Amino acid sequence: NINQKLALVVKSGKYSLGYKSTVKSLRQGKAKLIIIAANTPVLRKSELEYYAMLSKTKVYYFQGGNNELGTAVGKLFRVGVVTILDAGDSDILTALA
């Protein structure tokens, strides 16, 4: 499941945490897949989700809020939205999730 796969990214893989860096990297186009939390506000969910469609990027909805996504990406602090720029070792890019 997803948590195993984001662990596979965070060890050996390039990934961005949080919004501004996400967006920076949606506009650069480096973002291949962004993992948005739930609790992250619908505005900023819908904003990412817009940018995503211009960048033709996958948006995986991590079922669960932002304290438990930080967990899932081997972080302490809460993270509202992750990007996966490159993580060829992992299978989240291949997976629909």
Partner 1 sequence: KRTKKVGITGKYGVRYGSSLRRQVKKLEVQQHATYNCSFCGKTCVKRGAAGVWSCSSCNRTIAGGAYTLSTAAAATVRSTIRRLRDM
Partner RNA sequence: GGUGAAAUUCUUGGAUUUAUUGAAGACUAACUACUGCGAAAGCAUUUGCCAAGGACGUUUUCAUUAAUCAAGAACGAAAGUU
Binding positions for RNA, 1-20, rule CB under 7 A: 1, 3
Q: Are 88 and 36 in contact (CB under 8 A)?
A: no
Half-sphere exposure of 93 (CA within 13 A, CB side): 15
- CB of 73 vs RNA, minimal distance in Å: 14
Binding residues for partner 1 restricted to 5-44, rule: CB under 8 A: 39, 41
The correct pick among 67, 71, 75, 97 for binding partner 1 (CB under 8 A) is: 67
Smallest separation, CB 79 to partner 1 (Å): 9
CA–CA distance, 27 with 12 (Å, rounded to integer): 24
Task: Tell me which DSSP letter residue 97 carries.
Answer: -
How many residues bind to partner 1 according to rule CB under 8 A? 7
Output phi, psi for 28, to 5 deg: -65, -30
Smallest separation (angstroms) from RNA to the CB of 74: 13
The interface partner of residue 21, options being RNA, partner 1, none and the CB cut-off 5 to 8 Å by kind, is none
**How far out from the chain centre does Cα 97 lie?**
11
SS3 at position 3: helix
Which residues contact RNA by CB under 7 A?
1, 3
